[PDB]
Amino acid sequence: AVQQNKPTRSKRGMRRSHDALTAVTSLSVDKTSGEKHLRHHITADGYYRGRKVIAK
């Protein structure tokens, strides 16, 4: 139920070796708007694949 010995800082780091986050490989660029966005996601200005989806 509980530990018999205090795990080391080395053991703590070893467990956290798989906790590293992964950054997005790259961001797509809208063909017309030209702004960066997540692939398959609309841009911040409401564009997607150069179609100007609803932006209100």
Partner RNA sequence: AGGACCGAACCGACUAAUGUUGAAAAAUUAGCGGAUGACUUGUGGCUGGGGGUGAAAGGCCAAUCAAACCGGGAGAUAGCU
Partner RNA sequence: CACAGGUGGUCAGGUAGAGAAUACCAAGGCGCUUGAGAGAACUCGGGUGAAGGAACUAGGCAAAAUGGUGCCGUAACUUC
Partner RNA sequence: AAUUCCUUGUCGGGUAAGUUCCGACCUGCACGAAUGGCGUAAUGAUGGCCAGGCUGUCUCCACCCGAGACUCAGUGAAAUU
Partner RNA sequence: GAUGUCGGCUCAUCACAUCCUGGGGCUGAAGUAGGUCCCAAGGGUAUGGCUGUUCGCCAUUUAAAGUGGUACGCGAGCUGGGUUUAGAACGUCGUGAGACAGUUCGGUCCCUAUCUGCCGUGGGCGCUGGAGAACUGAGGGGGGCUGCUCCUAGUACGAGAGGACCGGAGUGGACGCAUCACUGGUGUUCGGGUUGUCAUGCCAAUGGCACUGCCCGGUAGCUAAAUGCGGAAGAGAUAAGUGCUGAAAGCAUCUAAGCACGAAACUUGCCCCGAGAUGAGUUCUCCCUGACCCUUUAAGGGUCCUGAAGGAACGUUGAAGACGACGACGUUGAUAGGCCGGGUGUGUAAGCGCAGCGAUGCGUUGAGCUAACCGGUACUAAUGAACCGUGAGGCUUAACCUU
Question: Which residues of this chain interact with RNA, rule CB under 7 A?
Answer: 1-7, 18, 24-26, 28-31, 39-40, 48-49
3-state SS of 1-56 is: CCCCCCCCHHHHHHHHHHCCCCCCCCCEECCCCCCEECCCCCCCCCCCCCCCCCCC
Report, in Å, the least distance between residue 53 CB and RNA: 9
Can you name the residues that pair with 47 across neighbouring β-strands? none
CB of 44 to RNA, least distance (A): 14
Pick the closer one to RNA by CB: 12 or 56: 12
Nearest approach in angstroms of CB 45 to RNA is 15
